Amino acid sequence: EAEDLQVGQVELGGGPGAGSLQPLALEGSLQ
């Protein structure tokens, strides 16, 4: 699968349909 390819907490590389909200992403480059 490709969902193990990003899982939205390692690379994701998105925004809305990524790993949830930026602040709510516990990531985003540290906002």
Side-chain angles (χ1 to χ4, degrees):
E1 298 253 326
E3 294 231 83
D4 187 274
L5 238 15
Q6 316 104 217
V7 304
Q9 72 230 139
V10 1
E11 109 175 26
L12 350 64
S20 91
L21 246 295
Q22 8 261 253
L24 317 187
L26 210 91
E27 285 101 47
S29 220
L30 289 303
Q31 292 261 221

